[model samples]
Target: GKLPPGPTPLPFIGNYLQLNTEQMYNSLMKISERYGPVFTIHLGPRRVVVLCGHDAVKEALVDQAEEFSGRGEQATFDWLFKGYGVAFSNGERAKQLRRFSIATLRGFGVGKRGIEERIQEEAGFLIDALRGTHGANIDPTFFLSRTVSNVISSIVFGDRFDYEDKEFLSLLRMMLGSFQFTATSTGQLYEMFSSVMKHLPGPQQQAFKELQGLEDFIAKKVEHNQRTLDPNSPRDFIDSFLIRMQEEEKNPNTEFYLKNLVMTTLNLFFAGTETVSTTLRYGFLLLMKHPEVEAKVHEEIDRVIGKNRQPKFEDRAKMPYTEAVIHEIQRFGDMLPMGLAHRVNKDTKFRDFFLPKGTEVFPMLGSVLRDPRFFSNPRDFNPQHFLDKKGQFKKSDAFVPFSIGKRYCFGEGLARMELFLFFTTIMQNFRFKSPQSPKDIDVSPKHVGFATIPRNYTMSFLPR
Candidate 1:
């Protein structure tokens, strides 16, 4: 029973009373300085092994990749997913779902031109929406969220939503609520005591209710896709999944099923929506805060992409400075600081310690991103971290906002395409300025927990 060492727990409260939950990742980053890279901290009733810094996390997630491939439990998602969907499932289910997802997404134009066109189309709508803003001072949260969500809608439902669509807006609300739940007090407690909290009166009840409504919406979409399905030409993700379900219907062991269809669709849609949008939201603040960087980005966009043409994925290779800036935003934003939990599927030896089967681990990616060993300006918003002396784009092994190894983000390819296209397209058409002066523009996240949400601020999109 060899386990990594950590602070002593004073009974059932565990480490809950020992640290601040609001700044949980910050606390984890600091505390591990004394406890070494790998250590244990109990959250409510569960023990989670925390891996910090680049060396320890890289060793666990990358070197012992297979041993750490199992997705660990988060009570809220576990209750909803019930180990059925791609995101939360384990063992063979996880393996099959990931393989199928990668293959199927490839067919749907992911990592290729098909998805690129969809992103480009959505970016135009985004520009049109911003033009309608007409240099008016407005919070960019709504605009960015809708634009990102529409890209997901295009790929998943075979269509995009109007920026003002009633149904689309409601769905966005529900999705946001469900995601933001993990950042709330009840959300934290529910994960600690999911069984106890579910039966009681609390805000978590509202979250559960929202999840149900979201599921109902996804369920309807699945049935609609089922009815209109054509095997000869699959439309989007749903049609393809449905066709796969039918093809494997006779095989009782098949992981493809209706529940998976609904849940995984929900997974894809939610994953697609917030993370990228929040990054862009936080990113704009960074750009406005430093007009020096902003002017440089404008020059790079004009130089590489120009006025007459749209920014293509291929253009990213030539726009080294712009590429570096986007990566810097992701590194600085550090949205998923805590990251999702990972578990060792079997009894394993990591470094010198013995980890038994099903031991929960937090591969504290925030630590890796800001590890002093890698980024010299780890705490600053510096694009030069991703550039060398000549300022060409440079790659770092520690740059892992999308995570590392087998369980890395499922929407990685699509997310990269969206980030490049949407970012470049917006900059091409508009000159964003803070209503406040550069120094006065506060860029700290408004909320911090499961995701780091940018504080709401207003800006003007002057037509360039």
Candidate 2:
């Protein structure tokens, strides 16, 4: 297969100049329009195949999965994650880690009674905190992220912490900062120049160090669990993994050992916490920006959940519009544009192009999610994208926020439930309003990371 046409590249610079100038995804869209949907570009001597359109992305990621099974941990991820878990691992190890994680998550009541109860408990605590706001402009980003993360933490640690708890709060802040730092230009440069950057002293360097320290913190907690845990009774994620480790220790091929367990735990913690909360915060930003949408959501919740009652998972059937709004928030905000780098494992043909093995592939989820063919007014914040004619909730095939393919988001089930529950639970108790004009709050800084987060914005939560 031949390769799609792209701009000429320098010998060493490759596509680094293009990325350094602007967002690689935006440039790829422009490149796709000028050339075609599937095209290739270079990033500092690294050839990257850009996958656009849902068909192209889905086909390559999901259908032709084996051909794209190679891994590219990138320096940043390996340094922060320690190559101990699913995202960075490929082949048998990746498969085993993902399998164990999903199984363990289900075992912990991911979609069932146990996890639901944990989420509800955290939601109760979160609602109490928001209710105390008393109509003041509350920056719900950090607090919301922490609360959502705590739900996962509770599941993993068999415990939950108050927002003011020093360790809980500090760990949350550092992890978030590491996430934020990982999305910077310097962060990307760190991946490209890890060898040189590691020896240097800067914020990015500090971020890497702190990120590792967070991993160490996780390791310490796991050790504590090991000392006190019994394989007969699983307490949290550590105990669960420890038990699994004991069972698999006899197998030399087992990758779900202590190191991988720590990595996988961090994966769930970082991914589950940040993405859901940021997306929910984006919901508030959207509602504050579009009062009509906000009013409609209020009406739907009022009619279904009622003023005094909290929204439950069971309320999903009764609250179609609210549910649709949650889906629309993800679609419109499209928080993650281009996630982790997925490389081609063998010579592959994409849209008549021969993408050689080792080429980095950037799957633009933003382009696919907002594809006009599958959506009405793809640019607008319309909940109708997720609703049928009668206003019943529906999921769009293009709704690949978790990203599709062999590497689709592992925490999709948990993330979706958290987003739905947290959004409805908060909205039922309070209405979020922009403290300043809508123009001031419309800012969405495109962070370069495993995901994108909204620019810092504030909103007031008034009691209903």
Candidate 3:
């Protein structure tokens, strides 16, 4: 098979020496400038391709989804995750898990009243937690992180925890720590050479050990429920999985076992919790910097839900400008800056380039989100990007924050609900304020694993 042109490399290094572990996007952007939107390179021994710009990403993701099924399963991510969950599953397994996850979440009210109530309850606690500081400066990350984490916990485990609970706090810290470590160069190297690195000791091992705790926690929960669980009526994720496993066992082809069940629940926690909380933290940071946009949001809240009551989804209609503000914040933040990498399941041709099977492909959703062709002032945070002349909420194929196609984020519905509920709740109850030189504050994100989390800083939560 003919392969795409790229810089020739030595046998072992294979472009590995050119890799910049610190800023992956900067490296890719540099390469794209030289070779255009679609470029090829060897990542270690793996031959990979990248698709940049809106046209390229959109065409590849939406038009050619059949050839781009699951993830590239990059060495590090695979070692850390074991590739059992919906996020990493491929082919039939991926199809089944994705369908089951969406259906089950819908049954539990993913985008409806039931899930919204849980988010509202957490938002109330989050407000109380923020209020404990007496509107004084405190890092919003922890409070928001804990609150968001518990929303998923309540959904899966049927319970939430107090902030002071030592065990719960430890679990939360470990989860975040695991994400942080896995995105490091050390972690990547270990995945590339696990056969050799597994015997040696490093910080990555510590991160892996902590990650095991999360998996063990899920295992313990499943074991406890297995003793008391009734097949006729399943309660949470574990029970529901157990019921599915029993049914699938009767069939020869489909097998949904305990390993997949435990890992899938852990996937829900890993994929769902950190992302929304991190994005919201960035939203507040941006608001502190851009006071005018923040004030506009406040006025919208006052006009719609008022300060006396919490915001509701129904009020979203009257709060189009506020919703547009959140959308702009996401676009400007560019949270997933490098976009998730995908792979070719079969041989595929794009224009004159023939990409062989098994070539790793990186689709830059971040670039697409800010491409000048689609959005005006791509770098600037303008809510008008989603507003028509009459000023109504306008969504388009270009505004794909949740991604698109087969490998798109399975928790899109849940993430949207969480963001709307948590964001509106906070905006309605209080205003986020920075200190004397508020504009001097940095909204730049500090690297944390797969996601770009805002720097640890303080902001005041004043009662509206």
Candidate 4:
């Protein structure tokens, strides 16, 4: 009686049949209009409280921070992660692992000046690779993935892989394949029925198999780091975590064990590599679609940091147009429309709504990002969303592609630097031309579920 208003559910399937699993964010926004911002929705047997708009999401995730800090559990994630990492674990274990990861990343130069040099170096490598393409139409996904992966790889493994490394490329391919399956309708079905699907057969098996491969790869890396462990002089994330494990080994209840190390590293690598690269891919596509925008970026790059000089993090401050364009690209890309679900830590009241402890909550970020009240043109790709009337870079509190609150992306700083440096560096050196006419290119997402991934298309990179 105390729960929020929502459509009644059947015994087993709940409202799964009524909702669009692929465009769950859009569907929930419509549902929110009918049932209000803080309403309940049934996904199969599970109940998820859908928090729509900036106010509702902020109130629940920000103001009621402690009560909503718990990461929600999903059957699919449970089977895959097995309560090992910060992503799926709860209580003290989750808290400890998250803190360690944040500190380790900072020590390795995340959100700091040290990582900028690494990204700038990779940007050079990326430019060289693109120059080799010689204005030919080819999929840029793998190239971008490799470039970004190497950046994170440097921190996690203490080294970066060569772009031509077959074994490393295979692992990245496997990771992308799993991402595709996980965002497919089959993945959603598996989430609702993973217990039963585990006994049966389908795409979930392949996805899980790929996951195991990733875990195995991480495990081998961990073993190698262990053999070469050095407490006096730690190297990268793996080595730092190892030192912590040794320090806490006598506690008996420490979460800094090997499994936590592997899973936490996996989480960082998986996140640090995929979404950022995908966002880059989509950003380039948008630039190709809007040549005027592209030309303006080129103008800004030339004026701010001439082709003779590489674009730096400092350049972002002086180049408002480029910064605004990056922000708009992220807003329009709508990657992770429905952010990773969170859990209510304790029974709580939110605006006449009584949510029980451990209720899963989906803060529909898509709604807030696309809310008409915030952006002058929510449906269109306009850099003005992040720019003031004076053409200065201005960020809206509503512009939360990384999602807000305590559970926001831990890699936010590294990702921001990567986007600015990579995007500007490329624009500074080259111009892109899609095989299709700019008018003919469809900017709609190829798939929509856990993420709003852009449709794949090849473009020619012409050297300026």
Q: Is candidate 2 or candidate 3 better by lDDT?
A: 2
TM per candidate comes to 0.97, 0.93, 0.93, 0.98
Q: Write the per-residue lDDT of candidate 3 for residues 164-255, one digit (tens) a residue.
A: 88877777777777666645666545544566666788876777777788888888998998898999987777788888988888787774
Whole-model lDDT per candidate: 0.85, 0.77, 0.76, 0.86
Error of 3 at 270 (Å): 1.3
| Cα lDDT, model 4, residue 42 | 82
Clashes of each: 0, 7, 0, 0
lDDT of 4 by residue, 1-464 (tens): 38889888886788876687676666777788998888888887888888888898889888988888878866656776888887778878888988888888888888878899999988889999999988889899998999999999999998999999999898898778888775677777776666678888898887788888999999999999999888989988999999988999899978889888899899988988998899999999998889999999999998989986987899999999999999899999888877888998889888888888988998888888988889999999999889888999998988888888878887888899999989998888899999888899999888877777789899899888
Give per-residue CA lDDT, model 2, range 1-464, as digits (tens): 46777778888667666555335456667778886777777666666777788887787888888776667646666755655687788778888888878888898899887777778788888887887877787677777977888888887777887788888777777677877776676776665556677888876766776677778878888889988988898988788889888988899888868778888877777777777877877778788877787888888888888887766788888888888888888888777776667888788876556877777787778888889899989888788888998889987889888887778887888887888888777877887778777666664555745456677777788887
Worst 10 residues of 4 by lDDT: 17-26
RMSD of each: 1.5, 2.1, 2.2, 1.2
Q: Pick the candidate with the highest TM-score.
A: 4
- Candidate 4 wrong stretches, greater than 4 Å: none
Give me the overall lDDT of model 3.
Answer: 0.76
User: Once superposed on the true structure, which residue ranges of model 2 sit more than 4 Å away at CA?
Assistant: 446-450
Q: After superposition, how far is residue 405 of candidate 4 from its true place, in Å?
A: 1.4
Candidate 2: the clashing residue pairs are: 1-354, 2-353, 2-354, 3-353, 3-354, 15-42, 156-237
